Amino acid sequence: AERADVVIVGAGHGGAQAAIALRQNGFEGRVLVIGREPEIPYERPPLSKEYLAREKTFERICIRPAQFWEDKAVEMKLGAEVVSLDPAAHTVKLGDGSAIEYGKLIWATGGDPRRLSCVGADLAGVHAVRTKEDADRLMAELDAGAKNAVVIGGGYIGLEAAAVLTKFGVNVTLLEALPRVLARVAGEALSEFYQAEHRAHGVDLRTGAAMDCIEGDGTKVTGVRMQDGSVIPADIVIVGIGIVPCVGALISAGASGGNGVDVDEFCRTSLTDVYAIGDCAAHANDFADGAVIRLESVQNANDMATAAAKDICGAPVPYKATPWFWSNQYDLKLQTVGLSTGHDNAVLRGDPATRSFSVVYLKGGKVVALDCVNMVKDYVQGKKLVEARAQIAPEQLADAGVPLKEMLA
Ligand SMILES: Cc1cc2nc3c(=O)[nH]c(=O)nc-3n(C[C@H](O)[C@H](O)[C@H](O)COP(=O)(O)OP(=O)(O)OC[C@H]3O[C@@H](n4cnc5c(N)ncnc54)[C@H](O)[C@@H]3O)c2cc1C
Known part of the structure; x- marks a missing residue:
């Protein structure tokens, strides 16, 4: 049976930083990371910024160069996903049926976008811009002449995606259900500023705009059915709303947590020897007056990766960093x-x-x-x-x- 001393599931920010942190703190056992995406760890913030706008190559968005992982003895099973786990047997089951055994486990799976199709099937080109693969398709579709884009959600990703889309000279409509953009993350002073700025850049920005589902022709997106219930024509849809923590296998295995998976200040879940870090892990935060929240940022992924690793190395230092x-x-x-x-x-x-x-x-x-x-x-x-x-x-x-x-x- 294939076994590693530490198994990291997910090869994004959390995963990569977790592997880096391990070695930097002197861990010597076998380290294996399983990531469902085919490419080596790469940065996600560029996907709605410099990468989408073709100001950086894929090489310049990689977290570490290929040789680094070789040097640090970080083994990687890319294009492979963990489908379930047995916390008792200390075992992980993969999408091809194979099983890998772990000493410690780090769950760094992040989250996935909501499915918003009227008839439930996947549609091109509806994009959450959460993978290099997805960004590349959007880019190809833009080259091929797609010109009417509807952005769903007025959070940071939505605004960024809208902004880079206008640089491509296409029509951008942004839909915000709340009375203002950024309502969940900033005050009205910021909202007004960004709404004014985006509109001055040609974005048709609509607040209090409640959407029903995304229409297609059986193959590709054609519009956004509103709840009122008009249809906005679109050949590109950006889904920039709350993601769903990729936590299913943990909950199924008995891990506690209402919003993603709960972890303590050392990033330990309720299951023995399994950690969770990054977007998928809820944690009590001093800067949120003790409330258990789930931060979705690079800083948070980095810092949780550090804490899980330090604990695994036997020199625990609590996650107390400023967000x-x-x-x-x-x-x-x-x-x-x-x-x-x-x-x-x-x-x-x-x-x-x-x-x-x-x-x-x-x-x-x-x-x-x-x-x-x-x-x-x-x-x-x-x-x-x-x-x-x-x-x-x-x-x-x-x-x-x-x-x-x-x-x-
Ligand atoms: C477009 C975009 C722009 C962003 N911009 C910023 C920004 O400017 N500043 C900022 O602070 N944050 C930004 N973020 C958020 C930031 O990227 C995330 O907080 C960070 O990626 C979280 O790290 P993570 O490891 O938990 O998740 P991820 O980095 O997303 O890694 C999760 C990985 O696990 C994989 N995975 C999922 N399920 C499985 C499975 N079952 N088995 C194996 N692998 C699996 C996924 O394919 C994914 O590659 C942005 C996010 C997006 C999508």
């Missing part, structure tokens, strides 16, 4: 630190008209988050304020003429 995020749309470079969710005050810092400003978020008089559009100084210094839970007057924060670092006691 951060970024979004690149047009010439707008957003950098976010902390979690704004549940803020009671959002202080505008600078002038949105200059397209370089910050929003400082507070809760109960304490700084909890920053959104920084082309404002790296505020982002860098703001981290300290977020970590300090700094109690600074809004009247002080709002003065862009004073550096944030000067404000803390």
Whole structure:
């Protein structure tokens, strides 16, 4: 029976970083990663940014070069997926029926997009832009002359995808069910800014737009059936709504968790010797006042990968890192630190008209988050304020003429 000391399932950010972290902390056993995609670990943020826009090759988005994995003795079974697991037998079953045995297991499977077809079948070219493969198809379809795109969801991915699509000179309609874009991740100051910016770039942006399902001709997408129930014609649909954690096999095996899979501060699930990291793993977060949340970011994947590995190496260090995020749309470079969710005050810092400003978020008089559009100084210094839970007057924060670092006691 094929067996590894550590088996990593998923070869994305979590998986790759998990393997890197293992070796960097001196792990010497066999390390095997099983990833359902055919290519070596590559970065996902480019899929709605520089890669989709053909400013980077595939080589320049790879997490590590091919030779690195050879050097670090990281074995990889690509184009293979774990279909189930037996936590008792410490065993994993693959899509071809074969079984691999593990000492420790790291579940880094991320999530998958919602299926939104009117008649339930897969449609070209409906894209979540979550794989290199999918991005490549969208790119090919654009070359071949597809010109009417409908983006579903006003989250970061949706906006980014919309933005790069306008660079291709095609028609872009964005649909947001909520009263504003970014409603789940930022305040109204940011929303207004991005809505205004996108519209100025030719995007037909529609809020309170509730969608039913995606129409096709049996082979390809032709429109988006709304709930009202008009149809918007489309030859391209971008699905940018909440993903579903690829967690099924864990739940089936008895792992606890309502939203993905639950893990402690060492990224351990309720099943012995199995960890979960990245998009699929829910965790109690200090910057969310103890609530068990499921962050979907590179920072989070990186940091959970580290904690799982350190624990596996026998030198555990809790996952206590400060959450951060970024979004690149047009010439707008957003950098976010902390979690704004549940803020009671959002202080505008600078002038949105200059397209370089910050929003400082507070809760109960304490700084909890920053959104920084082309404002790296505020982002860098703001981290300290977020970590300090700094109690600074809004009247002080709002003065862009004073550096944030000067404000803390
Ligand atoms: C278009 C796009 C843009 C993004 N931009 C940003 C950004 O700008 N900044 C930021 O912080 N975050 C961004 N993100 C989010 C970030 O990429 C994710 O948080 C990160 O990928 C999570 O790491 P992960 O390992 O948990 O999931 P992933 O990196 O997605 O890796 C999961 C891998 O596991 C594989 N898998 C699934 N099921 C199985 C199975 N059963 N067996 C084996 N393998 C399996 C999948 O094929 C996938 O390759 C973006 C995401 C997308 C989709």
